[PDB]
Structures are given as structure tokens and as C-alpha cells.
Amino acid sequence: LPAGVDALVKDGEEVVKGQELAPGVVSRMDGVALYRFPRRVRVDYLRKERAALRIPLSAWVEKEAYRPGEVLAELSEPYLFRAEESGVVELKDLAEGHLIYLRQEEEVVARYFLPAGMTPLVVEGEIVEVGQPLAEGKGLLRLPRHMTAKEVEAEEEGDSVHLTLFLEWTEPKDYKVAPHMNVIVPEGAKVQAGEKIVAAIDPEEEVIAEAEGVVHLHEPASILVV
Amino acid sequence: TSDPVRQYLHEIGQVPLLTLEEEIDLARKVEEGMEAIKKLSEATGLDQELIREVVRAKILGTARIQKIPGLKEKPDPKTVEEVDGKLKSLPKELKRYLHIAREGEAARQHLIEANL
């Protein structure tokens, strides 16, 4: 396998004669393919947040759990999403979506979620006020494609309805392995937080899990099918 | 006319060399195996070289290693098999160091052959 090329088939999987194991690698024998010295190791980290969004009920589509890419509400006219609290802001762009952390002094006041299509009207470090405009939906506004949603919380006192969500998603990360390094956990292995993904000669060069998630192996130096 | 030297030359010619990666991996697997034997020595209360050779008995061939050391070295059913059974009584954390050990043992052979 040429340096800087990934594998089409994941480690420890059945393969057939003629099947491509890579753009340049075609298997001549049916068997079980195995990675040899992966040049790159990716990881997926789990991110939990409990986040609130207020949207008019004449818009909102009734759903218990929205999923990646799943269409969120409607919003006839470009409804401005106005802050229910006062604080500083933390503008966190998650893929196509956004997150606003209303913070006072040390601890945050509240945390609000912006679906794709609801654009931030503020900038991180700026101050908001009670009822002050935070974001603006253009209508549409579906939940992003890398993120999921669980535990619907619906509170409606009127035309507008406040929705608290338990929002969890997967943030990607990449580690470039060296010859010093030796990969430990297998492909698609569910890993804990702080665990050592890939060892090495001196621990300074090692790979320590930054959070709880799953590990992936890529760019094998070679692929041995037996 | 059946040269003894070309035999060995083409015999070592079958196993390719080793770059930095393969070499480091080998050595590391070896030391890992040996230290594994060091812990396994505290496991059943045995020696280093004892369990170390017991591993060989199960790897580089079974009956053949204990069969012809010469007329007397060590008994196969007595001082060997009991070592196999005695180390079979151990849980996960322990029993895995065995596989680590034998793995390192193979790595040693691969290392010697690669640099031949």
C-alpha cells in the first residue's frame, strides 16, 4: 500500500478475489483482511449538552427525538429567537449548527441550541439582555447531520413554545501515528476517557484519549488477507 | 551438484528484510513477552527460564524439543506437562500474559531470521 492512502475495507473483514482493498490493491484470494502498521488513527468523541430552544408552536413539528438531518419545525416568517436570559456569549459552531452559552462571571447562566438555518445574531464575548435577540431562523431550520437529539422537554405557555433537549453528538479527531507508536485497541473499539489509545517508546509521544468515544484505524502500511 | 551454500543462501532469501517499523515492533513485542514471563513467574511461583522454555515446547514444536535433547535433560510428562496444567488455573489478567509471552517468543525468531 502506498503512503498516504486509506483502505476501503475495515480491519478484520471478509474480502473476495477481485475485490478492491484500496485504489491500487485488488485481492486475489477470498479471506479475512488484516491491517498492518496503520499510518493514521482517527477517533470519534461523544459530546453531551442539555440545550434549550424556543420556537413558535405554529411552526414546530411535533417530535420526541430529532435525528441527524431530520427536518426541524417550519417557521413561516423569519422568527428571531430571543434570549430568555442575560449574559455573555460563547459562540460554538458545530458543523452546520451553532451553540450559545449565556455566562455570568464564572458559571454559565443558560445554554441555547441553534439548529442549521437559525443564524447567530451575536458574536462571542458580546453581552445579551433578557428578551434581547439572539439568533434568527429563516424558516426551515433542521437539526444538523452529525448530531442527535434525545429526551424531548416541551413547555408551552402560549404562541411560542420552549423546548429543552438532551443533545449528544460525535466530534471527529485525528492522530498521526509514528514508527515509535504501537496501536493497542482494535478497530471500532469503544474506548473510555483518558485511556491510552496508542502506546509509544516515551509516553511524551503516546496517544491518550481526550474523552469518551470510539476509535478508528486508517491508512494501513499494508493489508494482509489470510 | 547440490551446493550446501546456495541452499542456505536461497533459504534466507525467502524471508525479506525489516525496516524501522517492523524492527521496533519486533523488539517491543519481545521485551513485552519476557516481562510477561517475569510476572508469570510471580503468578505460579516459578522461574524465568522455566516457563520461558515451557513456552518454546508449545511453539517451535511439541514432542520434538523434549524428545532429543539427548538421553537425559528433562522429563516431558513430569516436569513439563505439570507446568502447563499449573498455569491453566489462572484468571484473565494472568492467563493473557501467557499469550503475550509466546507472541514475544515468536517475535524473537522472526527477528533472528530477518537479520540472518
Side-chain angles (χ1 to χ4, degrees), chain A, chain B residues 3-116:
Chain A
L1 202 279
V5 171
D6 205 329
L8 315 177
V9 45
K10 67 184 62 178
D11 179 89
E13 183 189 339
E14 252 72 16
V15 291
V16 195
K17 176 183 181 180
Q19 177 190 121
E20 285 195 350
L21 273 48
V25 176
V26 41
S27 181
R28 286 175 295 163
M29 55 115 59
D30 300 22
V32 182
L34 293 174
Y35 285 179
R36 310 261 292 184
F37 290 159
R39 307 284 188 84
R40 176 244 261 184
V41 171
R42 193 187 258 186
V43 95
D44 304 333
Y45 286 142
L46 274 67
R47 294 285 138 81
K48 317 299 146 178
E49 197 67 49
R50 208 150 49 257
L53 178 61
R54 171 178 296 272
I55 289 299
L57 181 59
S58 56
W60 179 36
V61 170
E62 327 277 303
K63 192 69 209 67
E64 185 178 12
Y66 287 99
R67 87 194 41 81
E70 171 79 341
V71 187
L72 167 57
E74 272 156 6
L75 269 194
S76 59
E77 284 310 298
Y79 160 83
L80 301 162
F81 169 57
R82 299 199 147 191
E84 205 175 81
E85 270 287 346
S86 63
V88 202
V89 287
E90 173 181 347
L91 230 187
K92 194 177 183 179
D93 288 40
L94 285 56
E96 63 255 85
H98 302 81
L99 273 191
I100 294 296
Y101 290 96
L102 292 199
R103 187 195 314 270
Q104 277 178 233
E105 313 175 43
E106 303 183 16
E107 105 276 45
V108 298
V109 193
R111 64 283 298 269
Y112 304 142
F113 147 78
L114 271 60
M118 184 180 303
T119 173
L121 270 44
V122 302
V123 180
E124 182 171 13
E126 283 194 8
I127 352 91
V128 304
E129 233 305 277
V130 189
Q132 199 202 298
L134 239 187
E136 181 244 46
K138 185 48 188 58
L140 287 66
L141 48 74
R142 69 207 77 89
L143 189 145
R145 66 113 188 276
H146 71 337
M147 154 183 249
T148 76
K150 299 183 185 179
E151 286 188 327
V152 55
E153 196 87 314
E155 173 181 326
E156 178 220 343
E157 51 274 321
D159 162 81
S160 59
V161 54
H162 159 52
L163 252 285
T164 356
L165 310 171
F166 193 81
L167 295 175
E168 43 187 299
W169 77 97
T170 52
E171 244 168 277
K173 193 76 248 80
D174 272 314
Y175 311 92
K176 180 146 65 178
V177 115
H180 317 148
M181 272 89 98
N182 46 315
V183 51
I184 302 183
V185 284
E187 173 63 88
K190 306 204 305 176
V191 79
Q192 275 299 140
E195 192 188 316
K196 177 205 306 176
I197 314 296
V198 176
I201 165 200
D202 35 39
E204 311 180 26
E205 206 64 29
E206 274 177 349
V207 178
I208 311 177
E210 193 168 347
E212 179 199 330
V214 66
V215 184
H216 296 292
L217 358 158
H218 293 303
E219 283 118 80
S222 51
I223 296 92
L224 161 64
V225 39
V226 195
Chain B
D3 197 317
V5 325
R6 282 170 175 82
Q7 183 120 44
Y8 199 58
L9 284 164
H10 245 301
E11 273 188 25
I12 74 170
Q14 250 62 87
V15 175
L17 276 180
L18 74 178
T19 55
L20 295 319
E21 282 184 333
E22 320 183 45
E23 194 182 61
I24 303 305
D25 168 45
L26 279 178
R28 188 262 309 177
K29 179 151 54 183
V30 169
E31 299 187 13
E32 273 188 337
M34 308 185 70
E35 299 171 32
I37 302 177
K38 178 180 177 59
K39 276 197 172 184
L40 289 174
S41 178
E42 312 166 26
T44 47
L46 271 52
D47 217 342
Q48 321 300 314
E49 174 76 312
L50 174 52
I51 320 177
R52 180 172 181 84
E53 284 189 289
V54 171
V55 171
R56 293 168 182 168
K58 218 168 180 59
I59 289 296
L60 78 332
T62 57
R64 78 161 310 175
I65 306 308
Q66 328 282 39
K67 216 64 62 180
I68 355 175
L71 75 165
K72 296 177 182 58
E73 225 293 314
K74 51 208 302 294
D76 212 344
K78 183 166 59 63
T79 54
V80 177
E81 218 296 315
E82 78 177 314
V83 185
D84 284 41
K86 186 169 50 263
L87 281 146
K88 189 54 186 302
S89 59
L90 284 58
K92 176 69 176 182
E93 301 286 301
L94 289 173
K95 194 80 71 60
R96 68 180 220 89
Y97 274 104
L98 143 76
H99 296 72
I100 303 176
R102 59 175 66 258
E103 217 154 293
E105 280 277 57
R108 167 159 154 256
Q109 317 305 314
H110 278 179
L111 206 164
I112 301 186
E113 300 158 28
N115 295 276
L116 214 168

